[PDB]
Amino acid sequence: QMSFTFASPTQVFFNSANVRQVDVPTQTGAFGILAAHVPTLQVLRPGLVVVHAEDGTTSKYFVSSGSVTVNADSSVQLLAEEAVTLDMLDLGAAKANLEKAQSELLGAADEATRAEIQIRIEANEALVKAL
Amino acid sequence: PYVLGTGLILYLLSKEIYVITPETFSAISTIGFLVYIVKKYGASVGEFADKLNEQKIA
Amino acid sequence: ITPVILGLPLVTLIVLFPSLLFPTSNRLVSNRFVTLQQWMLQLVSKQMMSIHNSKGQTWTLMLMSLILFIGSTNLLGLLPHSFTPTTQLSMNLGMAIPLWAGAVITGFRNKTKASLAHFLPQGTPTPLIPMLVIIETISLFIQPMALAVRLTANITAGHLLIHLIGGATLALMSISTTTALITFTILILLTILEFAVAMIQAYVFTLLVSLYLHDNT
Amino acid sequence: VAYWRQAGLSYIRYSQICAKAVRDALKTEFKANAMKTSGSTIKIVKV
Amino acid sequence: IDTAAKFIGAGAATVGVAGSGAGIGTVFGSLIIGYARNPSLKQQLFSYAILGFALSEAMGLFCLMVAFLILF
Amino acid sequence: IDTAAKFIGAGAATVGVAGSGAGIGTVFGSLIIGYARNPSLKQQLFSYAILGFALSEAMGLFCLMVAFLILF
Amino acid sequence: IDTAAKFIGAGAATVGVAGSGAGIGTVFGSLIIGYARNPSLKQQLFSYAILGFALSEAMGLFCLMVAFLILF
Amino acid sequence: IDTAAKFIGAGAATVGVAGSGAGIGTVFGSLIIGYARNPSLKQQLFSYAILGFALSEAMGLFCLMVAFLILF
Amino acid sequence: IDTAAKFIGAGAATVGVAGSGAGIGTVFGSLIIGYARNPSLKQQLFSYAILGFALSEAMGLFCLMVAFLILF
Amino acid sequence: IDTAAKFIGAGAATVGVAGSGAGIGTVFGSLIIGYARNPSLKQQLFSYAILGFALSEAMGLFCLMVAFLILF
Amino acid sequence: IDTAAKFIGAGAATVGVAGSGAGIGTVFGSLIIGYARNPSLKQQLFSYAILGFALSEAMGLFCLMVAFLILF
Amino acid sequence: IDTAAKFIGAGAATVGVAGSGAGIGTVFGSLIIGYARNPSLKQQLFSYAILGFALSEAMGLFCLMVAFLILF
Amino acid sequence: KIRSILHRTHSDQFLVTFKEVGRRPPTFGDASVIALELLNSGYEFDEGSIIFNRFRSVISYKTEEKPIFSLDTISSAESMSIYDDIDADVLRNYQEYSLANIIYYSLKE
Structure with missing residues (x-):
């Protein structure tokens, strides 16, 4: 599983929350890292962040930037420079x-x-x- | 060990009854048959730790 | 008569002792005897149960009997000769109908026109295109079931060739052995790399296919 | 990308342009709130 | 000529299994690099490798039908 | 000559299914590593796999149309 | 010799369609492993996939016109 | 006609191994590049390379049995 | 003899055009994954892809000239 | 015929070394891509590259054995 | 036989140009997917592509001289 | 027949140079896409480029040895 | 404050100093600000620690310290590169990004 840590400096949305996957428009790419996943650093593009929360729910976001940080472990941390929920766009x-x-x-x-x-x-x- | 010896005897009997076999082909396959054993005997010792302990536990 | 008649009883009896011995192990003895043999079905209930259920415990032992039967059936074509080229081939062809019928039992028996409706509705076969479904029923059964016979016949082959090339190599170099022994020692070890691997993976095909049956069952 | 990243441009700059573009983005008062984040006043002392 | 061309013709149709042979190594190769990216092994990914080895051995079974038509 | 060269020439056209069988292992393998990066399984990716294998086995059905036209 | 060699001469030119068979699987397969990186599917990538599939069936439009010349 | 065509039948049937050798290079390459991404090497992935190098050689024992059939 | 084996010599020369067809897909398919990393479309990669399409179809031109040599 | 077809059959079996040659490049190429990802060059990955050149030259020694048997 | 099988022997020697044509597609494709990573266009990656297409059509000039030996 | 088959047999082993010429296109390709990852261009990767093009041209120099033996 | 309690020693060996250091509320924006050009500097990063007052509770902070290894050969090296599993872009561009985060954080603490 993944402890998904979703935050912007300004807003922390999910924090090591048992999210299944997040498909992340890292500048790196859009990849859907599910759960744990090797150390990897991927820098967040602007795109939308789709937080396949371990529950069929996916929260939507736009991510602008930052980096998501892929531990080895389960906890994966999007630290988006800007991450906003699509709701306000x-x-x-x-x-x-x-x-x-x-x-x-x-x-x-x-x-x-x-x-x-x-x-x-x-x-x-x-x-x-x-x- | 006893089981292995029985299997070898059976193979010989089959060859002696049925004509179709060259000395060559047999020489070979017989060397083939031999090889598997020796690796096994080191394994045959190694085996037991799992199974007899696993029976005891369950 | 005797030759063909002796082989099939032997094959059964080698599976019958394990299949009788394990039932016996459920209270006695064990001495050397019972505990020793328990390891046989412990290897099955260890190794194959790592993959099984999977499809569910329900089907598990039904397939494991065939998985052991295939490996044991091929092993009962290992030693005998003349037997690999004939009797194990007739057992490869005699497992052919069982392999065909294995898709029949649930697939073609319940749905001949689309046994991929039990096997795979969408995948390989196109669920929009029952034609591609049925075509590939060949490649997933009618085929692969005959190839699974051909697969053990591939082994019977490559095993037969070791034998005919060996007999031909030692007929060429009837030195006793001697330098032909070096190549022939390799050709022996090729029996493990070829037959003993591919024979394995041939029953691994029956494992996976009968897993995909019962895993969707 | 690299038309910026290989415009060099701080990753921060990128980001900050992105983010800034987000700040640029947003609706109504939401977009008001933009400025919060762009506390960036930080007097430019520099030795 | 009648027993000659069907004996050399059944050999040329056995060059159709060179496609299914390397086509089976690729579908089982991309599943080795795919499960390396992890982790949906059982179901989804390794359940599609059967759907990829069936559509590849379908041309193999179509080629092994041709070589057996000139052999029997 | 008129019937002999029709049995060994229908065997050389069965080697044209070597491209449809190795190509199918490339159209499904590049779909295995494709859905590994994920996530559009149903629609987009696997839908493009069906329109790709149809354009891969088309050179197998047309090659089995030049095979069966030499024997029937 | 004249009519006999025209039968085992368009059959060897029919195995040239194995390059177009797997070439269409390599082209469309890369497009399935490309739109997975996303998102320029509509135009740019799939529009270029129609330029790569035409330049791969171009060898298929020159190899099938060869076997159809030794026929009639 | 009878003694000759069986020698030019097991020769073209050995051109089916051209997939079992290249496909094994495809699977063992994808396990060589797959283990680089790490870490399931002594389990999971290299245990799937044995299941890939067998299915590739499965059309390399089926093709080899046909070349051993035309000869002896 | 003179008119016979010239017809079966042009057919096997047309099988040398199976490298250009699968070469065309593996050169215009790597550029279909190059612009997927972006953004050198109509700049560097698509310009070198034409310089990659020419180096592969020339080995199809040097093979179709052998097929035209044994035809006129 | 009998001393003729042995030379037009032992040559067709050398076309089975096309998989052994292109399998050696693919197993080593992905080893050159796997050691480009770092770092276990000394054993583990390039050690497995020897276990990939062996299971790829085995389908090239078995094909060279059938060619040598039809020549001597 | 003498003035016949050399015309059908230059056709089989021109099938060796399926590796010099499909080797150029593999070479001038990875130098298009590698330049997509950037920025070693000149002096490094494309310079090694001149030494990549030098050992690719080297098997093709050796296959174009083998067919030239069975003609002139 | 005795003089005819040697010419037809030399060309058939020259088709086994299609595997060595594409295996050099894969080894030098995955080194061109193995140098873009950087930075050990000299040594390690391109030093093993000749070590990967030696075992892949080893199948060509053995095949062109069986093609020359039927010519001299 | 670090300005004559420290910009007067390292008033030179300082790389930058920022003002508006508090006295109106600083934000991440500022952290980025201060980040961005800092990079785009000529004093390249050799060592580096970030000292701030790490709040512990209102009652307490402990002037905290972190290591700053913006130097992208820290990142590019060691096990760190083995925890990387992807190139010297994001390396820098995280080293970067994370630097702002910490900067912000540290600052805010």
């Missing part, structure tokens, strides 16, 4: 953001800036996932 904006984003990227000359946009684009998109 905003399509009107998601699109809206995306438009803008896409507008900005274009002038966001230089990889970093572009990036910042792109990140953002990606972000809005990744919201757009859920939105």
Whole structure:
């Protein structure tokens, strides 16, 4: 099983809670680490975090970032820089953001800036996932 | 040990009754038959610790 | 007559003593005798019970009898000769119908048209496509059941070839042995790497298939 | 990705842009609450 | 010619088991690397390896039917 | 000549099922490690496995259509 | 010799479909192990899978046109 | 016709072992790369490589018995 | 003899085009898993995939030229 | 015929060494990918690579035995 | 026989170009899935790809000279 | 027949160079995807690249020895 | 405060100092802030401990210390790399990420 530790600095949602699996859009990938799982560090992308809680319930989240930390053990810890439950997120904006984003990227000359946009684009998109 | 000896005797009888067998082929398979035993006898000692203790426990 | 008649009784009797001896072990004696033999069904109830149930205790001993029977049946084609090429092949073919009927008992007997409705509704066979279901009923039974005969016949083969190549190798190098002994000593050890492994995994196929039967049963 | 990560950019920066983009995200008052997290005032002393 | 071409023709159809032979090592190989990623061994993963060895030996059983048609 | 070369030539077309049988172990094996990273079992992944094996055994059914056209 | 060798000459060109048979399983199999990493399934990946399956059935459109030339 | 075609029948039946040797390299490679990710080596996974190297050689004993049938 | 074994010489030359067909899938399938790691589509990997499709179909061109040599 | 078909049969059995050759590359390639994941190079993983080159050259020595038997 | 079987012997020697064609697909595929990890495009990974496609078509030039010896 | 079969038998063993040429494509491929993981490029991996391409070209130099023996 | 109780010795050997250190509520954002550029520094990390007052209860804190091994060859090395089981990105980018977390934490403590 997994002690799933789900937190952002700001909010701790599940804490070593007997969750079955979390499929995690780590920048690393989306993988569904169930239970324990070898030491691995995977850094959290923005995506949505789907917390297959050992009970057929899955809580939804958007994760923005952070890292999930994969112990060897059962306890797996998403420490998402930002992790929010999808509940509070905003399509009107998601699109809206995306438009803008896409507008900005274009002038966001230089990889970093572009990036910042792109990140953002990606972000809005990744919201757009859920939105 | 006694069981193994009986099995060998039976094999010989079957070969002697039935014609179909080259000296060669037999030489071989007979070397094959031999090999398995020796590994087994080191095992045949090793076996007992599990089973006789497991009977006693259950 | 006698030759064929003596072999099948012997095969039964070797399984009959374990199958009589274990029933006997339930109170006496044990001396050397009973406790020694208890180890036989302890190895079965140790080894195979690590996989069994699984499908449930209900089916477990039903399959374990066949699993032991297959390994014991192949072992009763090990020693005899002429026997591996003929009698063990007739026992491989004589296990063929039992292997065919093993899918029949619950699969084809209850559903011939789609024994994958008991075996596997969605998987290999397409549950949207009863055609692919039935095609692969061959590969999961009609086939694999005949290949499971061919599988022990593969062993009978590769075992026969060791023998014919050996007899031919020692006929080529009738040195007594001598240098042909080196290769032939390898060809002997190949009997373990080939027959004794693949014979194993051949009954492992019967294990898994009769597990997938009863595990979904 | 790497258009940022190999824009170098602190992982923090990434993250922080992400997160910031989350802050950017959110609905109504929820989005108000964004600013909490972006306590980031932290005067820039630097020796 | 009549007993010749059916004896050399039954040999060429036995080159269809080279597909099912290596096709069985891959489906049982990706199940070895899959259960390495863990942990749904019994059921789901190793229950699909039977569904992958059946659709691969189906072309083998289709090829072993051809070589036995020119042999008997 | 007209019937002899029809029995040894229908055997060489049975070696074209070596691709449909080794390819099926690649279309199911890359689906075993695919669902190992998970989680879309029913739909998406296994649905794409069916549309892949159909495009793998199609070169086995067309090769058994050129086999049976040389013997029947 | 003339009509006899045209029968065991399109049968050896029918075993060239074993490359397209397993090549379609390697292409579609990688797409099943690609969309599992997610999420660009619609377009990008599955759209490129139609470019890889056409470039693998291209050798199948040149090998089946060879055996159909030695027929009629 | 009778003495010749049995020698060119067990020769093309030895081209079915081309899968039992490569498929064993596929399964034992996936156990070589699988044990790298660790840690079930002396159990679970290397006990599944013996069950894979057998099913691969299962089309390598079925093919070998046909080449031993055409000869003797 | 002169007209006979030239027809059975072009057919086995068409079996050398089984490497290009399975080579085309294993080169445009690794790029179907490359863009799955992203984001060099129409940049580096898809550009080298054409330089990988050319190096494999050339070994199909150097084999189809042998099949055309024993046909005209 | 009898002193002829022994040369057109012992050569077809050398095509069984195609699995022994491509099995040695796959078992060693995944050993080169397994030792790239680190760290048990000295025994455990490259030790098992010897147990993978042996169970892959065995389907190449049994195929070379049948080719040597039809030549001498 | 003499001016016949050499024309059907150059067809069987051109089947060795199924390894130089499917070896290029395996080589120029892992250097496309490896560059996806980045950023050793020049000087390292693609430079080793020149030494990867040098020992791949080396078995094909040795197979194109074997067919050239059975023609000229 | 006595002079015919040697020519047809030399080409048949030249088809066994399709396994060595793809086994070199897998060993050098998994070294190209084994150097992207980094960093011991010199020694360890690419030093075992010639040690993995030696046992895989060992099946080709033995096969091209059986192809040359039927020619000289 | 560490500013003349410490920025006056290591007023040089300091890498940064932050102000607004309290005196309006600091947050994770700040931890990231302080994190980000810190990286993007030229004093690269050799050793490292984080000393903060670890609260224990209002009544108590014990000025705590942690080790800071941002130096990504700590991460890249030892058993640590064996507990890794995945590359020098996330290594750094966790080393990073976690640094902010702790930074935050430690700070908050």
